[PDB]
Every structure is written in C-alpha cells, then in structure tokens.
C-alpha cells in the first residue's frame, strides 16, 4: 500500500531524477531497477503500478550478476521484457507489449546486442522442461512481433558478434531450439514466419521446402560454417544430422566428388615424388638435375601444404588456439608440411640431421593418406576410431604400461647381471618380448627371475583386458548413432573447405537451393526465399489432415 503514496511523495518532493527509475550501482548488481524486482517476484499488479508511475520498461541490468560467462549468475538478457520472457511469465510479457502508456519493444537489445530471441537462445539447455518453455515463448513472441511490428524481421537483428538467434543456437550448441527453428511451421496467419513449407503433396509422397537463409554457405558466417569451425560444443556433430542439413550437405558433397578425387590424386602424386626422392638418397655421393627437380617440387608442395594449413588456421583459428581435439587431421598436415620444409632447408644447408627429418616427413605423409578415407563411409568410421583410440585411450594405457615396464626392466636386469645395465637395452629387450619380436636371454637368482616374469606376463595381460574392457565399455555406453555423426561432420568440414578454394581461387560456386515464392500475402510485395526441397513418403497420412501447399500438383 505504500508504493503509490511513496512515489507521489518523491514527485511532490521535486526530485528531478525520479525514484522509480533509480538503479543499482555496484559492479555486481549494476543496473537493477525496481521493475526488475517486481518482475522477478512474479507480481503483475506491481508491474502495472510501477509502469503506470513511469518505470522505464527498457532499463538494463548489466552488472556482473547479470552476465553470461559468470558462475552462479543469471543471464536473461538485460531488459525487463527478456526477464519476463526468460522466466515464463506470459501475463507479464503481454502487458509489457500491450500497455498503452509505455509499450516494451521487441527490437530492444542489451549490452551484447541480444534481443529477447537471443536471450531465450542463451537460457535454453537441452533439458526437456526448459526446452519446451523456450520454444513456446520464442514462437509466441514471433507471433506478437508480427502483430506489433510487421515490417521488422525479428530474427534478422544480429548481436555485436553478428549472430542471429539461429546462428547463436548453432554456435552455443542449443539443439532443441535450433532443431525447432529449422523445422518450423505456422498454421496461424503469420505464415511467413515459418521456415518449412510443403511445395506439393501427392498421395503418400510430398516435397517439403526448408528456408536456407542463415544456413546456406553463400552468406558469410553461415550456420554450416559456424558449426564446423566457430562452435565449440561437444555435441556439434549431433546438429549436422538434423533433417534439412544432412540432406543438404550430402547434395553439396555429391557435386564435389570430382574435386575430392582430383585432390586425392594430386596428393598421391606429390607423395610418389616424395617417395622417389627419399629412396634415391645416397648420403655421401640430366639425371642428377632431375633429382634436384624432385627436391624442388617437395619444397614447393611442402610450403603450399604449409601455406594451406596456415590459411585454414589463419582464416578462423585465431581465437581457438589449441584446437588439437577438434581438428586432429588438420594438425598432421601442418606438421608434415612444416617438417618437410624444415628438412629441405637443412638439405640445402648440408646438415646431416635432415635425413631423419626427410624420412620422418615421408612416413608421416603416407600415413596422412588416411585423411582421404572419409570419402567412403566404412573407411571413414574406421579412420575416426583410429583417431579416437590413438588420441584419448592410448595415452593412459601406455603411461601405466611404461611404469610396469620400467620398474620390471630395472629389477630383472639388475637381478640377472661391473655389471653394465642399459635402461634402453633393458626396457627394449623386455618390450620386444611382449611385442613377440625377440626372446629373453639367460645370464648364466634364476628362481626369482621366473617368479618376477610370471607377475609381468599376467599383469601385462590384466592391462590389456582393462584396455579392452574400458575401450569396450565406451562402445556399449555410447549411442550407436553418435560414432557415425563424427564422420558426417568431417565430411561437412571437407565440403566447406572445397567451397573456399585453393590459391588459384574457385569461389562463388553455384547456389545449392532453388528460390520460390513461398508466401502469397506478406505485408507488401511477395516474399521470395531460397529453399531446399526434400522429398518425403508417409504411408500413415490418410488419417491425418492434408497440409496447405504452395503448388496444386507436382508440376511447377
């Protein structure tokens, strides 16, 4: 009962800077206002009163507490509308949008350039209860936006990072809403807001159209480009398989099979020249000029590969820094190119250490050939598991195994054989035994040696079983769909890099979609869109109702 009197007093006291709009000052709570409080306390009657007494409906709570990167902090956008929306209070949201004195604006954005849509993308997580809320509010605001500001396309407003709500969902790994936006249909009048349409429908068959605006590679910072390189979520691969993108990326690949095979031949050749050059090396001592020809090409190609990989890392990798896990394949090419160029310098400068570097680059170059296995599915998954097993799993087994090997190696040599031990020769002789290469040599306490050996063979076997059990347990626990997605993302990487072009640029390749007039009655001229058509076949359609279609027949 004191708020209405209290404010009148403030005004009747001659305060130039009204009390209602007073905001907090500390770096922690900077910007909070009494309206923020009334909204968080979920009291519309208080909200109405504060607004009716001049509460600024666009005050931003910008303090550390309301920031996205902090822990134990709530980021909901900074504005009251975003708060009401982000805490699922439609009764509040509607009043902020519809009050006569001071309507809140759907276009408003915070210190990060985020609109209510941006924020809803931020607050969302993959939990079911949350996701259902976000889509419901998100859509409900688009409909409202069509009513309150038709000429404005709310999803077109970017933030300071130049990201639209869809691109934001992509970068931040928000699947449930990202998936919802791409497969969105509206049945109410604002048909234009939907990104999915059905061109035509005949019996069980039908063609669905998917808007490609923020998605297609043509535009800069496309969803595909963003996911491939900018997004840093573990489940990014999961996004690639979503209904419109998987078909689309397959189309782009099919058109790009030639370039892939071509590039495979080029690299293969380059390796053959590299192969010949290293075989014919004679150490100390037309044909001899041709051998120099080989070295030239290697130097020329090695820098080109080094340049290429640099361009890949130079183009987008500056803020990533250590992206070893994300792009294991890309690293090896850089190392091979780097090692190859360094080896040529030393070759030119008559350094006796180049030979190891030259052969090291050769062996690595041929092993890197596994890169191109991603063209086929079976080999691509096998190459993915190699990468996975070598990378995360082998390090821990080996680390434990060396401790057993080293400890057992010292004890057995020290025990067997003034007596000259070689830690290398010891660990080597014992490793080759397990490896099956050689056999153990008697010194000529034999009894203790045998008992110790029994512990080693069995314990070494235990480690193998753990590795198998731990490796095996990952496969059962892992979703069968998961391993396959990592490959489809690898392909997505390739297609995008091919569209980039070499050094002799081959850019502006033909668009992948077809443009149609999806909407007949926008507010003004007819709205054209670049859509991707996807054929569908549903045998249970007879019971369900028929969809509203653009065309009347498969023709046109």
Ligand X SMILES: C=C(C)[C@]12C[C@@H](C)[C@@]34O[C@](Cc5ccccc5)(O[C@@H]1[C@@H]3C=C(COC(=O)Cc1ccc(O)c(OC)c1)C[C@]1(O)C(=O)C(C)=C[C@@H]41)O2
CA dihedral 276, 282, 288, 289 (to 10 degrees): 60
For residue 228, state whether it binds its own copies (rule: CB under 8 A): yes
For residue 342, state whether it binds other proteins (rule: CB under 8 A): no
DSSP string, 423-491: HHHHHHHHHHHHHTS--------HHHHHHHHHHHHHHHHHHHHHHHHHHHHHHHHS-HHHHHHHHHHHH
Task: Please choose, from the candidates 46, 36, 39, 54, the residue with its C-alpha nearest in 3D space to the C-alpha of residue 2.
Answer: 46
Kind plus residue range of the DSSP H or E element containing 197: strand 196-202
Among the candidate windows 122-130, 342-350, 431-439, 440-448, which touches Ca ion by CB under 5 A?
A: 431-439
For residue 221, state whether it binds its own copies (rule: CB under 8 A): no
Say whether 5 sits in a helix, a strand or coil.
Answer: helix
Site for ligand X in 346-365 (CB under 6 A): 363-364
Nearer to its own copies, 137 or 358 (CB): 137
Shortest Å, Cβ 456 to other proteins: 18
Site for other proteins in 378-397 (CB under 8 A): 378-379, 382-383, 385-386, 389-390, 394
Shortest Å, Cβ 435 to other proteins: 6
Pairing of strands 205-211, 514-519: unpaired
Spell out the residues 6+ positions from residue 508 whose beta carbon is closer than 8 angstroms to its own.
none
User: How many residues bind to ligand X according to rule CB under 6 A?
Assistant: 13
For residue 178, state whether it binds its own copies (rule: CB under 8 A): no
Site for ligand X in 1-30 (CB under 6 A): none
What are the distances in angstroms from CA 17 to CA 23, 55, 58, 166? 11, 12, 16, 40
Report which residue's Cβ sits closest to Ca ion.
Answer: 436
Contact map string, positions 105 to 144, toward other proteins, x by CB under 8 A: ----------------------------------------
Q: Which does 382 bind (CB under 5 to 8 A by kind): its own copies, other proteins, Ca ion, none?
A: other proteins
- Return d(Cα 398, Cα 498) in angstroms, integer: 38
Nearer to its own copies, 282 or 524 (CB): 524
- Return d(Cα 22, Cα 20) in angstroms, integer: 6
- Return d(Cα 495, Cα 514) in angstroms, integer: 19
Q: Which does 232 bind (CB under 5 to 8 A by kind): other proteins, ligand X, its own copies, none?
A: none
Nearer to other proteins, 160 or 472 (CB): 472
Among the candidate windows 24-32, 330-338, 405-413, 467-475, which touches other proteins by CB under 8 A?
A: 467-475
Contact 378, 346 (CB under 8 A): no
Say whether 211 sits in a helix, a strand or coil.
Answer: strand
- Give φ, ψ of 207 to 5 degrees: -115, 125
- Return d(Cα 478, Cα 32) in angstroms, integer: 45
For residue 436, state whether it binds Ca ion (rule: CB under 5 A): yes
Site for other proteins in 267-306 (CB under 8 A): 275, 278-279, 281-283
Q: Which does 151 bind (CB under 5 to 8 A by kind): Ca ion, its own copies, ligand X, none?
A: its own copies
Contact 330, 312 (CB under 8 A): yes
Chain-centre distance of CA 318, in angstroms?
16
Site for its own copies in 84-113 (CB under 8 A): 86-88
- Looking at 272, 390, 469, 515, which residue binds ligand X (CB under 6 A)? 390
Nearer to ligand X, 35 or 277 (CB): 277
Pairing of strands 205-211, 527-537: antiparallel
Task: Please choose, from the candidates 394, 261, 230, 385, the residue with its C-alpha nearest in 3D space to the C-alpha of residue 323.
Answer: 230
For residue 468, state whether it binds its own copies (rule: CB under 8 A): no
Nearer to its own copies, 171 or 252 (CB): 252
For residue 501, state whether it binds its own copies (rule: CB under 8 A): no
Residues lying near ligand X in the complex (CB under 6 A) = 328-329, 332, 363-364, 367-368, 370-371, 383, 386-387, 390
Residues lying near other proteins in the complex (CB under 8 A) = 275, 278-279, 281-283, 352-356, 358-360, 362-363, 365-367, 369-370, 373, 378-379, 382-383, 385-386, 389-390, 394, 398, 435-438, 467-468, 471-472, 475-476, 480, 483
């Amino acid at each position: 009962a004191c708020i209405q009197p209290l404010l009148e007093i403030d005004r009747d006291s001659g305060n130039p800077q009204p009390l209602v709009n007073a905001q907090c000052t500390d770096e922690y709570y900077r910007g909070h206002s009494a309206l923020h409080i009334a909204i968080e306390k979920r009291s519309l009657q208080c909200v109405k009163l504060l607004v009716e007494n001049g509460a600024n409906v666009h005050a931003k709570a910008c303090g550390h507490f309301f920031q996205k990167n902090q822990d134990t902090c709530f980021y909901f956008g900074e504005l009251p509308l975003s708060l009401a929306a982000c805490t699922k209070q439609w009764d509040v949201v509607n009043y902020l949008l519809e009050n006569p004195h001071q309507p809140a604006s759907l276009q408003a954005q915070d210190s990060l350039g985020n609109t209510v849509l941006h924020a809803l993308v931020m607050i969302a997580d993959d939990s079911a209860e949350n996701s259902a809320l976000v889509v419901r509010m998100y859509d409900g605001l688009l409909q409202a936006g069509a009513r309150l500001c038709p000429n404005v396309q709310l999803e077109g407003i970017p933030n300071l990072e130049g990201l639209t709500p869809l691109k934001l969902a992509a970068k931040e790994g928000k699947i449930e809403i990202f998936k919802h936006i791409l497969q969105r249909e509206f049945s109410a009048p604002c048909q234009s807001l939907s990104r999915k349409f059905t061109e035509w429908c005949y019996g069980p068959v039908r063609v669905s159209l998917y808007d490609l605006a923020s998605v297609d590679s043509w535009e800069e910072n496309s969803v595909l480009e963003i996911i491939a390189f900018h997004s840093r979520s573990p489940h990014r691969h999961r996004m690639v398989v979503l209904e419109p993108l998987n078909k689309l990326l397959q189309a782009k690949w099919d058109r790009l099979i030639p370039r892939f095979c071509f590039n495979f031949l080029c690299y293969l050749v380059y390796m053959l020249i590299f192969t010949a050059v290293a075989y014919h090396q004679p150490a100390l001592e037309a044909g001899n000029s041709m051998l120099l020809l080989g070295h030239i090409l290697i130097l020329l190609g090695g820098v080109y590969l080094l340049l290429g990989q640099l361009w890949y890392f130079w183009r987008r990798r500056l803020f990533i820094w250590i992206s070893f896990m994300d792009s294991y394949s890309e690293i090896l090419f850089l190392l091979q190119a780097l090692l190859t160029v360094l080896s040529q310098v030393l070759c030119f400068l008559a350094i006796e250490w180049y030979l190891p570097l030259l052969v090291s680059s050769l062996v690595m170059g041929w092993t890197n050939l596994l890169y191109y296995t991603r063209g086929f599915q079976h080999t691509g998954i096998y190459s993915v598991m190699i990468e996975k097993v070598i990378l995360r799993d082998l390090l821990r087994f080996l680390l434990v195994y060396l401790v057993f090997l080293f400890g057992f190696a010292v004890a057995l040599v020290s025990l067997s054989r003034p007596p000259y031990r070689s830690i290398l020769d010891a660990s080597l002789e014992l490793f080759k035994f397990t490896i099956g290469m050689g056999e153990l040599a008697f010194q000529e306490f034999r009894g203790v040696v045998l008992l110790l050996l029994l512990a080693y063979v069995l314990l070494t076997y235990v480690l193998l079983l753990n590795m198998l059990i731990a490796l095996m347990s990952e496969t059962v626990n892992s979703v069968a769909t998961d391993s396959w997605s990592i490959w489809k993302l690898q392909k997505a990487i390739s297609v995008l890099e091919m569209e980039n072009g070499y050094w002799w640029c081959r850019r502006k390749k033909q668009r992948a979609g077809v443009m149609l007039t999806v909407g007949t009655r926008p507010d003004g001229s007819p709205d054209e869109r670049w859509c991707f058509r996807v054929g569908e076949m549903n045998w249970a359609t007879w019971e369900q109702t028929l969809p509203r279609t653009l065309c009347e027949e498969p023709s046109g």
